[PDB]
Amino acid sequence: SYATKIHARYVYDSRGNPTVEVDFTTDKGLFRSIVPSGASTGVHEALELRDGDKSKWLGKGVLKAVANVNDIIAPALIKAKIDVVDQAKIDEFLLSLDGTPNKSKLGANAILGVSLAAANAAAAAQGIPLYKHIANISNAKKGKFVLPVPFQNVLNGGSHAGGALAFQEFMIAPTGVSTFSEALRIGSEVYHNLKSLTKKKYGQSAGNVGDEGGVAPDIKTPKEALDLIMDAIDKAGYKGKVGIAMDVASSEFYKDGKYDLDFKNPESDPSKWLSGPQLADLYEQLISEYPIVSIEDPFAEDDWDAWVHFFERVGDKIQIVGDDLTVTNPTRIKTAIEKKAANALLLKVNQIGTLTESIQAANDSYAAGWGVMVSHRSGETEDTFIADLSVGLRSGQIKTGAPARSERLAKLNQILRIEEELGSEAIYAGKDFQKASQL
Amino acid sequence: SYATKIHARYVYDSRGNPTVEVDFTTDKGLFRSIVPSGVHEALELRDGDKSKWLGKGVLKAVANVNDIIAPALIKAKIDVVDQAKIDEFLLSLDGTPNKSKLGANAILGVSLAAANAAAAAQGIPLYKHIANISNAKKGKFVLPVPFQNVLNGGSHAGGALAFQEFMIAPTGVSTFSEALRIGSEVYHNLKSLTKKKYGQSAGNVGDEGGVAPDIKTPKEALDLIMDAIDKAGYKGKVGIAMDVASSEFYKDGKYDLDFKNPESDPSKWLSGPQLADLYEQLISEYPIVSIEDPFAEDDWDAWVHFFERVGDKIQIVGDDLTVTNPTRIKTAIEKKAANALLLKVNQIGTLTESIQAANDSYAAGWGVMVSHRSGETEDTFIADLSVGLRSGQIKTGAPARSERLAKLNQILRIEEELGSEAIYAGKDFQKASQL
Ligand SMILES: O=C(O)[C@@H](CO)OP(=O)(O)O
Numbered sequence: 001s002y003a004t005k006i007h008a009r010y011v012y013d014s015r016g017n018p019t020v021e022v023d024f025t026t027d028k029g030l031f032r033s034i035v036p037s038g039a040s041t042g043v044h045e046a047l048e049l050r051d052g053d054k055s056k057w058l059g060k061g062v063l064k065a066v067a068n069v070n071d072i073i074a075p076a077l078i079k080a081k082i083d084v085v086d087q088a089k090i091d092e093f094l095l096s097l098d099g100t101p102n103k104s105k106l107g108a109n110a111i112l113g114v115s116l117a118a119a120n121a122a123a124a125a126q127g128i129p130l131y132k133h134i135a136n137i138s139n140a141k142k143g144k145f146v147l148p149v150p151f152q153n154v155l156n157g158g159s160h161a162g163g164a165l166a167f168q169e170f171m172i173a174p175t176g177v178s179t180f181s182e183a184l185r186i187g188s189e190v191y192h193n194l195k196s197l198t199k200k201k202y203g204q205s206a207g208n209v210g211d212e213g214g215v216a217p218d219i220k221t222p223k224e225a226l227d228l229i230m231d232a233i234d235k236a237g238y239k240g241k242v243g244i245a246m247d248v249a250s251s252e253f254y255k256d257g258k259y260d261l262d263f264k265n266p267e268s269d270p271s272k273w274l275s276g277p278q279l280a281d282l283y284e285q286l287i288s289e290y291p292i293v294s295i296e297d298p299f300a301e302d303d304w305d306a307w308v309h310f311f312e313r314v315g316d317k318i319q320i321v322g323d324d325l326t327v328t329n330p331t332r333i334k335t336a337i338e339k340k341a342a343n344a345l346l347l348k349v350n351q352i353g354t355l356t357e358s359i360q361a362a363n364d365s366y367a368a369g370w371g372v373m374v375s376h377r378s379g380e381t382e383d384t385f386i387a388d389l390s391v392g393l394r395s396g397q398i399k400t401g402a403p404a405r406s407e408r409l410a411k412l413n414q415i416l417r418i419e420e421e422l423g424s425e426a427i428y429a430g431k432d433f434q435k436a437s438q439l
Numbered sequence: 440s441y442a443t444k445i446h447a448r449y450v451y452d453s454r455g456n457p458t459v460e461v462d463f464t465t466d467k468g469l470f471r472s473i474v475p476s477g478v479h480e481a482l483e484l485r486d487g488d489k490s491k492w493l494g495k496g497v498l499k500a501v502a503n504v505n506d507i508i509a510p511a512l513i514k515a516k517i518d519v520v521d522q523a524k525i526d527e528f529l530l531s532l533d534g535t536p537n538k539s540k541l542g543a544n545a546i547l548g549v550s551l552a553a554a555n556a557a558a559a560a561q562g563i564p565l566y567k568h569i570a571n572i573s574n575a576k577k578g579k580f581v582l583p584v585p586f587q588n589v590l591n592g593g594s595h596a597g598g599a600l601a602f603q604e605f606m607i608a609p610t611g612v613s614t615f616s617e618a619l620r621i622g623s624e625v626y627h628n629l630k631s632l633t634k635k636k637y638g639q640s641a642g643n644v645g646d647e648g649g650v651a652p653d654i655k656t657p658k659e660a661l662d663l664i665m666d667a668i669d670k671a672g673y674k675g676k677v678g679i680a681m682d683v684a685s686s687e688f689y690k691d692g693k694y695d696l697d698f699k700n701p702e703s704d705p706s707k708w709l710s711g712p713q714l715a716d717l718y719e720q721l722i723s724e725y726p727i728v729s730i731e732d733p734f735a736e737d738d739w740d741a742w743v744h745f746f747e748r749v750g751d752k753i754q755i756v757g758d759d760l761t762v763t764n765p766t767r768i769k770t771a772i773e774k775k776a777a778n779a780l781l782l783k784v785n786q787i788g789t790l791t792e793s794i795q796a797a798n799d800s801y802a803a804g805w806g807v808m809v810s811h812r813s814g815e816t817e818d819t820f821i822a823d824l825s826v827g828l829r830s831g832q833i834k835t836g837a838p839a840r841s842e843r844l845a846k847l848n849q850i851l852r853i854e855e856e857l858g859s860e861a862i863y864a865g866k867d868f869q870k871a872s873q874l
């Protein structure tokens with residue numbers, strides 16, 4: 001099976017900004033993939049190509065990226081007649097057209113849609129589900145399929161919501177149940193309880209949501225957020241069954257070698273900005289005070305010494321996830337493994353730009369004993385690729401939003417479909433999320 | 440082409456509540472539909488088990504599809520292209536006047552999925568199959584004006600603002616693509632202005648993707664929208680629509696525009712005529728092109744009087760008035776209460792009945808605005824429905840949250856597919872079905 005037609009268009013993401021959609025046609029039909037887009041994007045991410053025409057979409061058009069697909073990538077790839085099942089060859093071909101380390105000739109947002117749609121087409125060519133094709137090409141361990149713990153960002157801050165809260169994501173992780181369906185039900189019940197409690201304490205507007213569907217109360221401290229979530233877990237009836245995770249996204253508030261926990265205040269007092277050591281101490285206290293099982297981007301994207309020190313302190317007690325640190329990039333992951341800076345990778349296909357490189361990132365992580373959490377971006381779409389990716393890679397953990405806003409539920413609903421299809425051939429990762437690939 | 444397998448499951452809607460999804464398999468493949476969620480409505484069946492989803496499970500509706508509808512329909516071997524026969528069969532199976540045995544949520548999923556299978560059986564897009572079975576005027580397809588709910592009040596905001604929905608309608612351009620782009624730009628400008636004026640928190644979004652700052656008066660809301668249109672660079676090109684949802688503040692035959700204040704002075708509540716005056720003033724000061732539920736759901740005389748006043752200058756839309764209900768619709772047409780209907784397919788429960796309600800409206804010279812629900816999904820059926828029915832109007836949210844954008848994105852795909860065989864309804868949205 002090879003591409004007969006490849007056509008790109010722009011569509012609107014969940015924030016109302018344009019992004020790239022690719023239609024990849026073979027003998028088996030038309031396969032569509034849509035590229036997501038971040039807000040708190042790491043400086044080391046592959047290039048997201050935007051038009052910069054201030055008169056259209058506030059400079060956020062993707063007409064140039066779409067044209068790169070239609071006029072450069074499409075005719076070259078179609079001429080090549082590459083078997084879509086050979087994902088590595090598809091991706092090698094796409095990388096050859098760009099020839100830059102950060103995909104800055106064509107744009108990662110031109111390349112990725114083609115890479116992902118090829119994988120969908122390949123699944124169809126073999127008459128297998130996408131998650132099985134991914135398990136094949138990633139060399140996942142053979143046995144039961146592992147369904148991921150849904151890490152649900154139920155309270156949004158940082159760059160994803162207006163208000164004072166600096167830390168980006170406060171997540172629940174329903175690890176203390178035996179099935180994915182139960183975990184999603186519990187997440188939805190805790191979330192609804194949280195919405196009710198948030199409106200009662202902070203007013204109706206606090207129950208409106210951030211970019212990823214979490215409630216967005218205007219609060220200044222992590223303690224206030226965590227206390228709210230603990231109350232929701234308790235009032236929903238699931239005390240002791242629900243872990244908490246954070247994405248600090250600390251690069252967003254790293255200034256003058258320090259960390260501003262009031263960074264959205266134009267008049268933030270710089271005498272109150274924390275050093276690396278001061279911020280590390282705050283985490284150690286929170287990890288003791290709350291059932292926090294995972295912290296992501298606790299220090300800035302190149303603040304290696306701070307990660308290394310913190311890992312020495314608490315790496316055996318919690319999952320420590322690289323996101324902006326690692327940017328789903330094997331070269332950065334190598335450095336992080338050598339330095340002992342983290343013990344898990346946040347896997348974002350659009351940080352690196354091809355499925356093959358994303359899978360290499362995952363396998364490099366697994367080889368080092370790391371966990372992998374497959375992730376959405378804050379600018380998401382109706383695309384559901386990451387659901388199948390999370391299952392195929394046997395990650396045992398996915399981050400794809402609060403159980404609100406359908407760019408989030410679309411992924412969670414797809415896992416429900418996968419769970420039903422597999423029946424007893426699947427197990428839910430549950431408490432084993434961190435080492436799920438080995439199960 | 441007939442059903443070889445029909446299977447339902449629950450999935451989660453855009454508010455995190457369960458809803459029904461149907462997989463309908465034929466020789467052409469698997470076709471999926473998902474049902475949305477919000478005495479005159481078809482009834483959605485919920486489980487009421489307070490220990491699961493706070494009583495909002497749809498296990499019973501799902502079981503009705505799997506154990507009752509699927510085997511009966513599969514046995515009957517009905518050609519899916521014959522939507523009317525499919526829906527007649529489904530209605531016969533239930534037999535109740537409001538679909539309360541099997542549930543409207545069980546019935547609609549099968550009805551919509553069958554339509555998708557039927558399009559595939561004929562090798563045509565869903566919007567074309569809908570055009571065919573609805574007997575839409577032959578000629579160019581009409582792409583709808585997106586009525587985009589950018590700013591919320593009423594029960595959706597903590598301020599005094601009594602009116603429920605403020606929408607933009609980018610009518611002053613020649614293409615759907617340009618309309619949607621302008622809508623996105625105006626929305627982003629509105630968000631920015633809202634955060635500046637009311638604080639960063641006021642930028643966080645409601646169920647349909649709009650913002651809900653603490654606003655005091657309709658004038659304050661409309662001035663904010665006008666400022667966003669102007670700052671975005673599209674002065675004169677963008678209409679405004681309102682959903683007043685006036686039943687929410689109708690008390691003792693009067694209209695309390697400060698209904699969220701428990702000490703609202705009843706001597707300041709507006710009479711029907713005073714509220715009509717207010718609307719007339721707003722229509723003269725702002726480019727308001729449509730008002731939904733300007734008067735309460737059974738305050739018929741008020742609608743009739745208001746229609747005689749301004750029915751020739753603006754669209755007047757029934758929602759609570761009409762409830763996608765054939766008899767309420769008849770009454771409204773006979774009384775001359777309004778000139779447009781909100782079409783909510785899940786309020787009536789089959790595609791055939793939805794199309795009948797649209798055609799009854801068109802026959803009376805009414806407009807039809809195809810509508811989302813508050814609880815939406817990644818399903819895009821209503822995009823193809825708005826195009827196939829030649830409605831010229833769709834209400835499917837702000838340009839934020841993908842249960843809203845998925846519909847608008849589908850229209851982009853339809854637009855590209857059609858090229859010169861499509862026209863944008865633009866300023867002609869009211870009578871688009873006759874364009
Ligand atoms: O930092 C993050 O983990 C992401 C995903 O939630 O947000 P964004 O896509 O804006 O980077």
Ligand SMILES: [Mg+2]
Nearest residue numbers: 038040041249
């Ligand atoms: Mg980020």
Ligand SMILES: [Mg+2]
Nearest residue numbers: 247249297323
């Ligand atoms: Mg992150």
Ligand SMILES: [Mg+2]
Nearest residue numbers: 682684731758
């Ligand atoms: Mg209404």
